[PDB]
Amino acid sequence: MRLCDRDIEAWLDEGRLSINPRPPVERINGATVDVRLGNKFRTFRGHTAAFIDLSGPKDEVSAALDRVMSDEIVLDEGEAFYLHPGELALAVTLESVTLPADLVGWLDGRSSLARLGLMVAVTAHRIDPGWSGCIVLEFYNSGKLPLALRPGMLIGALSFEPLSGPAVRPYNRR
Amino acid sequence: MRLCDRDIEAWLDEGRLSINPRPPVERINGATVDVRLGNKFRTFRGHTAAFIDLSGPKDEVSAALDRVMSDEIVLDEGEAFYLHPGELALAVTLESVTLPADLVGWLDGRSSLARLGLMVAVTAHRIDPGWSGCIVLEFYNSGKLPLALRPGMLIGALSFEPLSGPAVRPYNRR
Protein backbone atom coordinates (compact mmCIF):
# COMPACT_ATOMS: atom_id res chain seq x y z
CA MET A 1 0.00 0.00 0.00
CA ARG A 2 1.77 3.15 -1.11
CA LEU A 3 2.15 6.16 1.11
CA CYS A 4 0.37 9.18 -0.34
CA ASP A 5 2.16 12.52 -0.38
CA ARG A 6 0.72 13.64 2.97
CA ASP A 7 1.84 10.46 4.75
CA ILE A 8 5.31 10.60 3.16
CA GLU A 9 5.48 14.06 4.80
CA ALA A 10 4.37 12.44 8.10
CA TRP A 11 6.99 9.67 8.04
CA LEU A 12 9.63 12.35 7.21
CA ASP A 13 8.49 14.53 10.14
CA GLU A 14 8.52 11.56 12.61
CA GLY A 15 12.10 10.73 11.53
CA ARG A 16 11.03 7.25 10.45
CA LEU A 17 11.85 7.91 6.86
CA SER A 18 14.84 10.08 6.09
CA ILE A 19 15.72 11.87 2.82
CA ASN A 20 18.75 14.26 2.67
CA PRO A 21 18.40 16.93 1.64
CA ARG A 22 14.72 16.94 2.49
CA PRO A 23 12.65 17.71 -0.59
CA PRO A 24 10.12 20.49 -0.25
CA VAL A 25 6.37 20.23 -0.81
CA GLU A 26 6.92 20.93 -4.58
CA ARG A 27 8.66 17.58 -4.93
CA ILE A 28 6.28 15.41 -2.87
CA ASN A 29 3.10 14.63 -4.87
CA GLY A 30 0.48 11.89 -5.20
CA ALA A 31 2.49 8.85 -4.08
CA THR A 32 6.04 9.89 -4.95
CA VAL A 33 8.94 12.06 -3.97
CA ASP A 34 10.89 13.43 -6.92
CA VAL A 35 14.63 12.68 -6.76
CA ARG A 36 17.47 14.46 -8.44
CA LEU A 37 20.60 13.72 -10.39
CA GLY A 38 23.83 13.72 -8.41
CA ASN A 39 27.27 14.44 -9.72
CA LYS A 40 29.21 11.16 -9.80
CA PHE A 41 29.24 9.33 -13.19
CA ARG A 42 30.85 6.21 -14.59
CA THR A 43 31.16 4.71 -18.05
CA PHE A 44 32.45 1.49 -19.53
CA ARG A 45 35.98 1.00 -20.87
CA GLY A 46 35.82 -2.69 -21.94
CA HIS A 47 39.15 -3.10 -23.81
CA THR A 48 41.08 -4.37 -20.74
CA ALA A 49 38.64 -7.32 -20.27
CA ALA A 50 37.12 -10.03 -22.50
CA PHE A 51 33.98 -10.53 -20.45
CA ILE A 52 32.53 -10.15 -17.00
CA ASP A 53 31.67 -13.19 -14.92
CA LEU A 54 28.44 -12.38 -13.12
CA SER A 55 28.37 -15.52 -10.92
CA GLY A 56 30.66 -15.43 -7.88
CA PRO A 57 30.49 -13.26 -4.72
CA LYS A 58 29.88 -9.48 -4.40
CA ASP A 59 33.62 -8.87 -4.12
CA GLU A 60 34.23 -10.49 -7.58
CA VAL A 61 31.23 -8.68 -9.14
CA SER A 62 32.49 -5.44 -7.49
CA ALA A 63 36.15 -6.05 -8.47
CA ALA A 64 34.87 -6.54 -12.02
CA LEU A 65 32.76 -3.36 -11.79
CA ASP A 66 35.98 -1.38 -11.23
CA ARG A 67 38.29 -3.20 -13.61
CA VAL A 68 35.95 -2.27 -16.55
CA MET A 69 34.25 0.96 -15.41
CA SER A 70 35.99 4.32 -15.73
CA ASP A 71 37.18 6.57 -12.96
CA GLU A 72 34.60 8.65 -11.18
CA ILE A 73 33.54 11.59 -13.39
CA VAL A 74 32.52 14.73 -11.48
CA LEU A 75 30.92 17.51 -13.57
CA ASP A 76 31.50 21.21 -12.87
CA GLU A 77 28.79 23.85 -12.66
CA GLY A 78 27.19 24.15 -16.15
CA GLU A 79 28.47 20.81 -17.47
CA ALA A 80 26.29 18.03 -18.92
CA PHE A 81 27.05 14.33 -19.15
CA TYR A 82 26.13 13.07 -22.63
CA LEU A 83 24.82 9.56 -22.65
CA HIS A 84 25.14 8.28 -26.19
CA PRO A 85 22.80 5.84 -27.92
CA GLY A 86 23.36 2.25 -26.77
CA GLU A 87 25.50 3.36 -23.82
CA LEU A 88 25.11 2.16 -20.26
CA ALA A 89 26.27 4.70 -17.67
CA LEU A 90 26.29 4.73 -13.88
CA ALA A 91 25.24 7.63 -11.74
CA VAL A 92 23.85 8.48 -8.36
CA THR A 93 20.94 10.41 -6.80
CA LEU A 94 21.59 13.78 -5.25
CA GLU A 95 19.45 12.75 -2.28
CA SER A 96 20.54 10.28 0.36
CA VAL A 97 17.73 8.05 1.55
CA THR A 98 17.29 6.05 4.72
CA LEU A 99 14.44 3.57 5.15
CA PRO A 100 13.38 1.88 8.33
CA ALA A 101 12.95 -1.86 8.66
CA ASP A 102 9.20 -1.71 7.84
CA LEU A 103 9.23 0.34 4.64
CA VAL A 104 10.30 -0.66 1.11
CA GLY A 105 11.15 1.91 -1.57
CA TRP A 106 10.55 1.81 -5.32
CA LEU A 107 12.42 4.07 -7.73
CA ASP A 108 10.69 4.97 -10.98
CA GLY A 109 12.42 6.83 -13.75
CA ARG A 110 10.49 9.69 -15.28
CA SER A 111 8.13 8.77 -18.12
CA SER A 112 8.77 11.97 -20.11
CA LEU A 113 12.50 11.09 -20.19
CA ALA A 114 11.87 7.41 -20.99
CA ARG A 115 9.96 8.59 -24.08
CA LEU A 116 13.17 10.15 -25.36
CA GLY A 117 15.13 6.95 -24.63
CA LEU A 118 16.31 7.36 -21.01
CA MET A 119 16.06 3.97 -19.32
CA VAL A 120 16.54 3.94 -15.51
CA ALA A 121 16.33 0.86 -13.25
CA VAL A 122 14.43 -0.89 -15.17
CA THR A 123 15.66 -4.16 -13.58
CA ALA A 124 16.09 -3.41 -9.88
CA HIS A 125 13.94 -0.46 -8.73
CA ARG A 126 13.72 -1.71 -5.13
CA ILE A 127 15.12 0.25 -2.18
CA ASP A 128 15.27 -2.09 0.79
CA PRO A 129 14.12 -1.77 4.36
CA GLY A 130 17.26 -0.55 6.12
CA TRP A 131 18.83 0.97 3.02
CA SER A 132 20.75 4.10 3.92
CA GLY A 133 22.63 6.06 1.25
CA CYS A 134 22.52 7.49 -2.22
CA ILE A 135 20.84 5.45 -4.84
CA VAL A 136 23.16 4.21 -7.58
CA LEU A 137 21.55 4.64 -11.00
CA GLU A 138 22.18 2.79 -14.27
CA PHE A 139 21.13 4.68 -17.34
CA TYR A 140 20.67 3.17 -20.78
CA ASN A 141 20.11 5.24 -23.89
CA SER A 142 17.55 3.25 -25.85
CA GLY A 143 16.95 6.18 -28.17
CA LYS A 144 18.37 7.47 -31.42
CA LEU A 145 20.05 10.69 -30.16
CA PRO A 146 22.45 11.46 -27.34
CA LEU A 147 20.78 12.57 -24.11
CA ALA A 148 22.25 15.37 -22.03
CA LEU A 149 21.92 14.96 -18.26
CA ARG A 150 22.86 17.77 -15.80
CA PRO A 151 23.40 17.39 -12.03
CA GLY A 152 20.29 18.62 -10.15
CA MET A 153 17.70 17.62 -12.71
CA LEU A 154 14.72 15.52 -11.67
CA ILE A 155 15.77 11.98 -12.56
CA GLY A 156 13.22 9.72 -10.84
CA ALA A 157 10.45 9.26 -8.32
CA LEU A 158 10.49 7.35 -5.04
CA SER A 159 7.38 5.73 -3.71
CA PHE A 160 7.14 3.96 -0.33
CA GLU A 161 5.32 0.91 0.76
CA PRO A 162 4.88 -0.29 4.33
CA LEU A 163 5.74 -3.90 4.95
CA SER A 164 3.48 -6.39 6.69
CA GLY A 165 5.71 -5.98 9.73
CA PRO A 166 9.23 -4.74 10.56
CA ALA A 167 11.82 -6.87 8.79
CA VAL A 168 13.99 -9.17 10.92
CA ARG A 169 17.03 -8.85 8.59
CA PRO A 170 16.85 -5.41 7.00
CA TYR A 171 19.68 -4.14 4.81
CA ASN A 172 21.64 -2.42 7.54
CA ARG A 173 21.69 -5.58 9.77
CA ARG A 174 23.35 -8.47 7.94
CA MET B 1 -1.91 -4.04 -1.53
CA ARG B 2 -3.16 -4.87 -5.00
CA LEU B 3 -6.83 -5.03 -5.84
CA CYS B 4 -7.84 -8.51 -6.94
CA ASP B 5 -10.02 -8.92 -10.02
CA ARG B 6 -13.28 -8.90 -8.04
CA ASP B 7 -12.43 -5.65 -6.24
CA ILE B 8 -11.25 -3.98 -9.47
CA GLU B 9 -14.79 -4.80 -10.69
CA ALA B 10 -16.16 -3.20 -7.48
CA TRP B 11 -14.19 0.04 -7.82
CA LEU B 12 -15.31 0.20 -11.50
CA ASP B 13 -18.97 -0.29 -10.50
CA GLU B 14 -18.79 2.39 -7.75
CA GLY B 15 -17.35 4.87 -10.28
CA ARG B 16 -14.23 5.31 -8.16
CA LEU B 17 -12.01 3.85 -10.79
CA SER B 18 -12.82 4.56 -14.40
CA ILE B 19 -11.61 2.72 -17.54
CA ASN B 20 -13.03 3.64 -21.00
CA PRO B 21 -14.08 1.56 -22.70
CA ARG B 22 -14.80 -0.69 -19.76
CA PRO B 23 -13.11 -4.04 -20.20
CA PRO B 24 -15.30 -7.09 -19.80
CA VAL B 25 -14.80 -9.93 -17.33
CA GLU B 26 -12.48 -11.70 -19.88
CA ARG B 27 -9.92 -8.94 -19.42
CA ILE B 28 -10.04 -8.59 -15.62
CA ASN B 29 -8.11 -11.45 -13.94
CA GLY B 30 -6.08 -12.13 -10.78
CA ALA B 31 -4.80 -8.63 -9.99
CA THR B 32 -4.78 -7.00 -13.43
CA VAL B 33 -6.89 -5.53 -16.16
CA ASP B 34 -5.59 -6.22 -19.66
CA VAL B 35 -5.11 -3.07 -21.76
CA ARG B 36 -5.00 -2.72 -25.49
CA LEU B 37 -2.99 -1.04 -28.18
CA GLY B 38 -4.36 2.24 -29.48
CA ASN B 39 -3.80 3.74 -32.88
CA LYS B 40 -1.48 6.73 -32.48
CA PHE B 41 2.26 6.03 -33.11
CA ARG B 42 5.44 8.08 -33.19
CA THR B 43 9.01 7.39 -34.22
CA PHE B 44 12.30 9.21 -34.07
CA ARG B 45 13.71 11.35 -36.89
CA GLY B 46 16.98 12.56 -35.28
CA HIS B 47 18.72 14.27 -38.25
CA THR B 48 17.37 17.77 -37.43
CA ALA B 49 18.95 17.71 -33.92
CA ALA B 50 22.39 16.90 -32.46
CA PHE B 51 21.13 15.87 -29.03
CA ILE B 52 18.30 16.29 -26.60
CA ASP B 53 18.79 18.19 -23.37
CA LEU B 54 16.84 16.32 -20.72
CA SER B 55 17.33 18.90 -17.91
CA GLY B 56 15.09 21.97 -18.11
CA PRO B 57 11.28 22.28 -17.67
CA LYS B 58 8.49 20.11 -19.16
CA ASP B 59 7.96 22.63 -21.94
CA GLU B 60 11.62 22.22 -23.13
CA VAL B 61 11.47 18.40 -22.77
CA SER B 62 8.10 18.48 -24.63
CA ALA B 63 9.32 20.96 -27.30
CA ALA B 64 12.24 18.57 -27.82
CA LEU B 65 9.88 15.57 -27.98
CA ASP B 66 8.21 17.18 -31.03
CA ARG B 67 11.25 18.61 -32.76
CA VAL B 68 12.73 15.04 -33.04
CA MET B 69 9.67 12.75 -33.08
CA SER B 70 7.68 12.18 -36.27
CA ASP B 71 4.15 13.24 -37.00
CA GLU B 72 1.37 11.20 -35.49
CA ILE B 73 0.98 7.91 -37.41
CA VAL B 74 -2.56 6.52 -37.50
CA LEU B 75 -2.93 2.98 -38.90
CA ASP B 76 -5.93 1.88 -40.98
CA GLU B 77 -7.94 -1.28 -40.44
CA GLY B 78 -5.62 -4.26 -41.15
CA GLU B 79 -2.35 -2.31 -40.84
CA ALA B 80 0.53 -3.20 -38.51
CA PHE B 81 3.23 -0.91 -37.13
CA TYR B 82 6.62 -2.61 -37.46
CA LEU B 83 8.97 -1.82 -34.65
CA HIS B 84 12.45 -2.65 -35.86
CA PRO B 85 15.32 -3.95 -33.73
CA GLY B 86 16.91 -1.21 -31.62
CA GLU B 87 14.03 1.20 -32.31
CA LEU B 88 12.21 3.23 -29.70
CA ALA B 89 8.62 4.04 -30.65
CA LEU B 90 5.80 5.87 -28.89
CA ALA B 91 2.24 4.70 -28.73
CA VAL B 92 -0.87 4.89 -26.62
CA THR B 93 -3.39 2.58 -24.92
CA LEU B 94 -6.80 2.12 -26.47
CA GLU B 95 -8.35 2.52 -23.02
CA SER B 96 -8.60 5.81 -21.18
CA VAL B 97 -8.04 5.46 -17.45
CA THR B 98 -9.03 7.67 -14.55
CA LEU B 99 -7.75 7.06 -11.04
CA PRO B 100 -8.98 8.67 -7.87
CA ALA B 101 -6.71 10.39 -5.39
CA ASP B 102 -6.30 7.21 -3.26
CA LEU B 103 -5.33 4.67 -5.91
CA VAL B 104 -2.02 4.25 -7.78
CA GLY B 105 -1.76 2.29 -11.04
CA TRP B 106 1.06 0.10 -12.34
CA LEU B 107 1.36 -0.84 -16.01
CA ASP B 108 3.11 -4.10 -16.84
CA GLY B 109 3.94 -5.11 -20.36
CA ARG B 110 3.09 -8.67 -21.30
CA SER B 111 5.74 -11.28 -20.51
CA SER B 112 5.07 -13.37 -23.65
CA LEU B 113 5.81 -10.28 -25.78
CA ALA B 114 8.87 -9.28 -23.72
CA ARG B 115 10.31 -12.73 -24.51
CA LEU B 116 10.28 -11.82 -28.19
CA GLY B 117 11.95 -8.45 -27.46
CA LEU B 118 9.03 -6.07 -26.79
CA MET B 119 10.06 -3.74 -23.97
CA VAL B 120 7.29 -1.55 -22.48
CA ALA B 121 7.70 0.92 -19.58
CA VAL B 122 10.24 -0.50 -18.23
CA THR B 123 11.31 2.79 -16.55
CA ALA B 124 8.09 4.51 -15.51
CA HIS B 125 5.19 2.04 -15.07
CA ARG B 126 3.38 4.23 -12.53
CA ILE B 127 -0.09 5.68 -13.18
CA ASP B 128 -0.70 8.39 -10.60
CA PRO B 129 -3.58 9.12 -8.29
CA GLY B 130 -5.62 11.62 -10.29
CA TRP B 131 -4.32 10.50 -13.66
CA SER B 132 -7.04 10.75 -16.27
CA GLY B 133 -6.35 9.84 -19.90
CA CYS B 134 -4.76 7.38 -22.25
CA ILE B 135 -1.50 5.93 -21.22
CA VAL B 136 1.42 6.91 -23.46
CA LEU B 137 3.61 3.89 -24.20
CA GLU B 138 7.29 3.69 -25.18
CA PHE B 139 8.26 0.51 -26.93
CA TYR B 140 11.80 -0.73 -27.42
CA ASN B 141 12.68 -3.66 -29.63
CA SER B 142 15.41 -5.45 -27.70
CA GLY B 143 15.12 -8.46 -29.98
CA LYS B 144 16.69 -9.64 -33.21
CA LEU B 145 13.63 -9.43 -35.52
CA PRO B 146 11.09 -6.73 -36.26
CA LEU B 147 7.92 -6.93 -34.19
CA ALA B 148 4.53 -6.28 -35.74
CA LEU B 149 2.02 -4.49 -33.50
CA ARG B 150 -1.67 -4.03 -34.51
CA PRO B 151 -4.18 -1.65 -32.89
CA GLY B 152 -6.48 -3.59 -30.52
CA MET B 153 -3.98 -6.20 -29.39
CA LEU B 154 -3.40 -6.79 -25.70
CA ILE B 155 -0.33 -4.70 -24.92
CA GLY B 156 -0.14 -4.58 -21.11
CA ALA B 157 -1.75 -5.13 -17.74
CA LEU B 158 -2.89 -2.58 -15.18
CA SER B 159 -2.85 -3.37 -11.51
CA PHE B 160 -4.16 -1.03 -8.79
CA GLU B 161 -2.95 -0.30 -5.34
CA PRO B 162 -4.78 1.70 -2.69
CA LEU B 163 -2.78 4.42 -1.03
CA SER B 164 -2.45 4.87 2.71
CA GLY B 165 -4.90 7.74 2.38
CA PRO B 166 -6.26 10.05 -0.34
CA ALA B 167 -3.45 12.13 -1.81
CA VAL B 168 -3.42 15.87 -1.06
CA ARG B 169 -1.84 16.78 -4.44
CA PRO B 170 -2.99 14.17 -6.94
CA TYR B 171 -2.17 14.52 -10.63
CA ASN B 172 -5.30 16.39 -11.63
CA ARG B 173 -4.80 19.08 -8.88
CA ARG B 174 -1.46 20.83 -9.34
Add this chain to the structure above:
Amino acid sequence: MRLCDRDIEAWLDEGRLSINPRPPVERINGATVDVRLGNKFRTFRGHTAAFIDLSGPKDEVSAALDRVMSDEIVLDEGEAFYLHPGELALAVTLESVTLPADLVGWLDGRSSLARLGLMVAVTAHRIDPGWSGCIVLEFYNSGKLPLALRPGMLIGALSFEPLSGPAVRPYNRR
Protein backbone atom coordinates in the same frame (compact mmCIF):
# COMPACT_ATOMS: atom_id res chain seq x y z
CA MET C 1 1.90 -4.14 1.26
CA ARG C 2 4.99 -6.30 0.94
CA LEU C 3 5.62 -9.26 3.16
CA CYS C 4 8.76 -8.78 5.24
CA ASP C 5 11.25 -11.63 5.51
CA ARG C 6 9.70 -13.05 8.70
CA ASP C 7 6.20 -13.18 7.19
CA ILE C 8 7.49 -14.72 3.94
CA GLU C 9 8.85 -17.46 6.26
CA ALA C 10 5.37 -17.70 7.86
CA TRP C 11 3.47 -18.05 4.57
CA LEU C 12 6.05 -20.72 3.52
CA ASP C 13 5.56 -22.63 6.79
CA GLU C 14 1.72 -22.51 6.52
CA GLY C 15 1.95 -23.92 2.97
CA ARG C 16 0.17 -20.88 1.57
CA LEU C 17 3.15 -19.81 -0.42
CA SER C 18 5.32 -22.49 -1.95
CA ILE C 19 8.90 -22.21 -3.28
CA ASN C 20 10.80 -25.35 -4.44
CA PRO C 21 13.43 -25.90 -3.38
CA ARG C 22 12.76 -23.87 -0.26
CA PRO C 23 15.39 -21.19 0.18
CA PRO C 24 17.09 -21.06 3.54
CA VAL C 25 17.20 -18.09 5.91
CA GLU C 26 20.34 -16.76 4.06
CA ARG C 27 18.20 -16.08 0.99
CA ILE C 28 15.16 -14.50 2.69
CA ASN C 29 15.90 -10.88 3.71
CA GLY C 30 14.08 -7.56 4.17
CA ALA C 31 11.17 -8.01 1.75
CA THR C 32 12.61 -10.46 -0.78
CA VAL C 33 13.57 -14.03 -1.41
CA ASP C 34 16.65 -14.42 -3.59
CA VAL C 35 16.09 -16.66 -6.63
CA ARG C 36 18.61 -18.56 -8.66
CA LEU C 37 19.50 -19.24 -12.25
CA GLY C 38 18.22 -22.49 -13.70
CA ASN C 39 19.72 -24.46 -16.51
CA LYS C 40 17.47 -24.09 -19.56
CA PHE C 41 18.50 -21.35 -22.06
CA ARG C 42 17.26 -20.12 -25.42
CA THR C 43 18.57 -17.70 -28.01
CA PHE C 44 17.31 -16.16 -31.21
CA ARG C 45 17.99 -17.57 -34.69
CA GLY C 46 16.06 -15.04 -36.84
CA HIS C 47 17.14 -16.07 -40.38
CA THR C 48 14.14 -18.40 -40.96
CA ALA C 49 11.64 -15.54 -40.36
CA ALA C 50 11.19 -11.95 -41.61
CA PHE C 51 9.33 -10.70 -38.55
CA ILE C 52 7.18 -11.78 -35.66
CA ASP C 53 3.52 -10.82 -35.50
CA LEU C 54 2.78 -10.02 -31.88
CA SER C 55 -1.01 -9.59 -32.30
CA GLY C 56 -2.99 -12.84 -32.51
CA PRO C 57 -3.62 -15.53 -29.83
CA LYS C 58 -1.14 -17.18 -27.42
CA ASP C 59 -0.80 -20.16 -29.75
CA GLU C 60 0.44 -17.88 -32.62
CA VAL C 61 2.76 -15.91 -30.27
CA SER C 62 3.99 -19.27 -28.86
CA ALA C 63 4.31 -20.91 -32.32
CA ALA C 64 6.39 -17.87 -33.29
CA LEU C 65 8.47 -18.15 -30.10
CA ASP C 66 9.59 -21.62 -31.26
CA ARG C 67 9.98 -20.98 -34.97
CA VAL C 68 12.63 -18.27 -34.19
CA MET C 69 14.13 -19.34 -30.84
CA SER C 70 16.82 -22.03 -30.66
CA ASP C 71 16.55 -25.46 -29.14
CA GLU C 72 16.75 -25.72 -25.39
CA ILE C 73 20.37 -25.27 -24.24
CA VAL C 74 21.28 -27.19 -21.08
CA LEU C 75 24.70 -26.36 -19.55
CA ASP C 76 26.90 -28.97 -17.86
CA GLU C 77 28.58 -28.58 -14.50
CA GLY C 78 31.18 -25.76 -14.82
CA GLU C 79 29.72 -24.23 -18.00
CA ALA C 80 28.66 -20.59 -18.41
CA PHE C 81 26.17 -19.13 -20.87
CA TYR C 82 27.65 -15.99 -22.45
CA LEU C 83 25.10 -13.34 -23.18
CA HIS C 84 26.64 -11.00 -25.71
CA PRO C 85 26.02 -7.25 -25.98
CA GLY C 86 22.65 -6.47 -27.57
CA GLU C 87 21.47 -10.07 -27.22
CA LEU C 88 18.12 -11.14 -25.82
CA ALA C 89 18.19 -14.59 -24.23
CA LEU C 90 15.58 -16.69 -22.43
CA ALA C 91 16.17 -18.59 -19.25
CA VAL C 92 14.41 -19.92 -16.21
CA THR C 93 14.65 -19.77 -12.40
CA LEU C 94 16.01 -22.73 -10.52
CA GLU C 95 13.16 -22.39 -8.02
CA SER C 96 9.58 -23.32 -8.77
CA VAL C 97 7.08 -20.96 -7.20
CA THR C 98 3.42 -21.38 -6.34
CA LEU C 99 1.27 -18.47 -5.23
CA PRO C 100 -2.18 -18.63 -3.76
CA ALA C 101 -5.11 -16.66 -5.08
CA ASP C 102 -4.53 -13.75 -2.63
CA LEU C 103 -0.83 -13.06 -3.18
CA VAL C 104 0.91 -11.36 -6.13
CA GLY C 105 4.64 -11.76 -6.79
CA TRP C 106 7.15 -9.26 -8.17
CA LEU C 107 10.50 -10.34 -9.60
CA ASP C 108 13.36 -7.86 -9.44
CA GLY C 109 16.66 -8.45 -11.12
CA ARG C 110 19.73 -7.74 -9.05
CA SER C 111 20.98 -4.15 -9.10
CA SER C 112 24.68 -5.10 -8.98
CA LEU C 113 24.19 -7.13 -12.19
CA ALA C 114 22.08 -4.43 -13.87
CA ARG C 115 25.02 -2.05 -13.37
CA LEU C 116 27.12 -4.30 -15.58
CA GLY C 117 24.35 -4.43 -18.23
CA LEU C 118 22.17 -7.40 -17.18
CA MET C 119 18.55 -6.45 -17.83
CA VAL C 120 15.90 -8.83 -16.39
CA ALA C 121 12.11 -8.38 -16.65
CA VAL C 122 12.13 -5.18 -17.00
CA THR C 123 8.70 -5.24 -18.73
CA ALA C 124 6.69 -7.92 -16.93
CA HIS C 125 7.97 -8.57 -13.37
CA ARG C 126 4.57 -9.75 -12.11
CA ILE C 127 3.97 -13.28 -10.80
CA ASP C 128 0.23 -13.83 -10.63
CA PRO C 129 -2.04 -15.15 -7.94
CA GLY C 130 -2.30 -18.84 -8.83
CA TRP C 131 0.98 -18.97 -10.72
CA SER C 132 2.66 -22.32 -10.21
CA GLY C 133 5.97 -23.11 -11.91
CA CYS C 134 9.41 -21.86 -12.80
CA ILE C 135 9.70 -18.29 -13.78
CA VAL C 136 10.77 -17.75 -17.39
CA LEU C 137 13.41 -15.02 -17.61
CA GLU C 138 14.36 -12.74 -20.52
CA PHE C 139 17.82 -11.30 -20.29
CA TYR C 140 19.10 -8.37 -22.30
CA ASN C 141 22.73 -7.33 -22.37
CA SER C 142 22.59 -3.55 -22.37
CA GLY C 143 26.30 -3.34 -21.61
CA LYS C 144 29.51 -3.18 -23.59
CA LEU C 145 31.00 -6.60 -22.68
CA PRO C 146 29.66 -10.14 -22.74
CA LEU C 147 28.19 -11.32 -19.45
CA ALA C 148 28.80 -14.84 -18.19
CA LEU C 149 25.88 -16.46 -16.36
CA ARG C 150 26.23 -19.84 -14.53
CA PRO C 151 23.36 -22.06 -13.33
CA GLY C 152 22.86 -21.60 -9.55
CA MET C 153 23.85 -17.96 -9.34
CA LEU C 154 21.55 -15.47 -7.66
CA ILE C 155 19.63 -13.93 -10.56
CA GLY C 156 16.75 -12.01 -8.94
CA ALA C 157 14.60 -11.28 -5.93
CA LEU C 158 10.95 -12.14 -5.32
CA SER C 159 8.78 -9.95 -3.18
CA PHE C 160 5.17 -10.75 -2.26
CA GLU C 161 2.16 -8.59 -1.86
CA PRO C 162 -1.19 -9.64 -0.42
CA LEU C 163 -4.20 -8.75 -2.50
CA SER C 164 -7.25 -6.93 -1.20
CA GLY C 165 -9.01 -10.29 -1.21
CA PRO C 166 -8.60 -13.74 -2.82
CA ALA C 167 -8.84 -13.46 -6.59
CA VAL C 168 -11.92 -14.93 -8.29
CA ARG C 169 -10.00 -15.88 -11.48
CA PRO C 170 -6.42 -16.61 -10.45
CA TYR C 171 -3.92 -17.96 -12.96
CA ASN C 172 -4.52 -21.63 -12.28
CA ARG C 173 -8.35 -21.30 -12.79
CA ARG C 174 -9.11 -19.98 -16.27
